[PDB]
Structure 1
Amino acid sequence: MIHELLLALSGYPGSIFTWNKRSGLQVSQDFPFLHPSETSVLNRLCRLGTDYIRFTEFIEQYTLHGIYLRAFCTGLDSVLQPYRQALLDLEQEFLGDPHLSISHVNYFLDQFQLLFPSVMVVVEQIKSQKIHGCQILETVYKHSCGGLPPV
């Protein structure tokens, strides 16, 4: 189930983690093998997966036109690189000792959980206001004076 999840957090949905076009990633229903209390933390964990999927779908779509939009997505993958790299690691730690639970996996994301949310509305302002041209170099700058150090 661990390697099952680490793919769901990568952009591949399956039977355990269904995909909905409006809401986002979420667990289907109660599962007998697992506990009924975990059905929550996963839903808290998917609030992160939905961000990466809606990210990479937009990144590929390139959608509006202009070089400053092309380069924004070109750079948007660079900030998103430590997310992937930190996800490849989780499998290595689980390959060593088979006593690690979802608690530790949820704990490992830590920084990504408080970063994506603030870098989600920056994309939404673009696709909802047709920000064409060099005006992006301000719409991203007006959000660069944020307090959150990571952002």
Structure 2
Amino acid sequence: MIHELLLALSGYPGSIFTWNKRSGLQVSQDFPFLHPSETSVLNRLCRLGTDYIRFTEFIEQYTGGLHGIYLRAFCTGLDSVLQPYRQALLDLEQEFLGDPHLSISHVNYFLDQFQLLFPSVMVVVEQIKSQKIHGCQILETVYKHSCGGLPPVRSALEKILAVCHGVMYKQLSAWMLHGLLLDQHEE
């Protein structure tokens, strides 16, 4: 729960932090040795691990959404945006390697900057799944939230927009230059 917590936040669950497809990461709430307050802090941290497991499942499942290229560019942006969360977890591992007794409030203060960025990008993925957002409308969908107003969230979605603008410019440098379209069922 010092190493099991970094392991469950790494996206590999375990039967303290019981993975449930409904309740994400869930502590099993009845423990005679810990007590209800640290349980609440653990649940608060399990929100981040729940979002990370759902993100990695979405990326593994759709790296090729229902089949195709523009959301393929979205996931290649998405894992690279989630990369500093991994590397901050690896830095936590070295600090807990250095000192044998560090608090959860230590971990909470270090990971409360990703505690915001993850629920903000969840709605960006959720609109694409719900409205069956096909092809170039994903470009508009991430841009209407690129007017975000959390400045980390605005910059993090800007990286994704630049990535999938890469494949937009790639198709445009085919049809404007050599006169041929290169598109199967996306446009």
Same-fold call, TM cutoff 0.5? yes
CA offsets per residue over residues 6-61 of structure 1, 9 Å max, x none? Answer: 00101111111001111211101232333432010110111111100000000011
Higher helix share goes to which structure? 2
Q: Which structure is higher in RCO with an 8 Å CA cutoff and minimum separation 6?
A: 1
Which 10-residue stretch deviates more, 29-38 or 97-106?
29-38
CA deviations 1:85-131 (Å, max 9, x no partner) are 00011111111111211111111101100110111011010111110
- C-alpha displacement at 1:65, in angstroms? 2.5
Q: Tell me how far apart the structure 1 counterparts of residues 60 and 15 of structure 2 sit (CA, whole Å).
A: 25
Q: Which residue of 2 aligns with 1:19?
A: 19
Q: Distance in 2 between matches of 1:21 and 1:62?
A: 18
TM score, norm. by length of structure 2: 0.77
Higher mean alpha-carbon deviation, 56-65 vs 88-97, is at 56-65
Residue in structure 2 matched with residue 84 of structure 1 by the alignment: 86
Q: How many residue pairs align between the two structures?
A: 150
Larger Rg: 2
Q: Which among 108, 112, 115 is matched to residue 113 of structure 1? A: 115
Q: 8 Å contact 1:66–1:132 — kept in the other structure?
A: no
Superposition CA RMSD, Å: 1.2
Q: Structure 2: how far apart are the matches of 1:108 and 1:30?
A: 27
Q: Give 4+ residue runs of structure 1 displaced > 6 Å after superposition.
A: none
Hey, what does 2:129 align to over in structure 1?
Answer: 127
CA distance in 1, matches of 2:33, 2:105: 17
Q: Secondary structure at the match of 1:99?
A: coil
Q: Percent identity?
A: 100
Give how far 1:143 is off. 0.6
Contact 1:59 1:73 in 2 (8 A): yes
Retained in 2: the 8 A contact 1:65–1:132? Answer: no
Q: Which runs of 5+ in 2 are unaligned?
A: 153-187
TM-score (norm 1): 0.95
Structure 1 spans left out of the alignment, 5+ residues: none
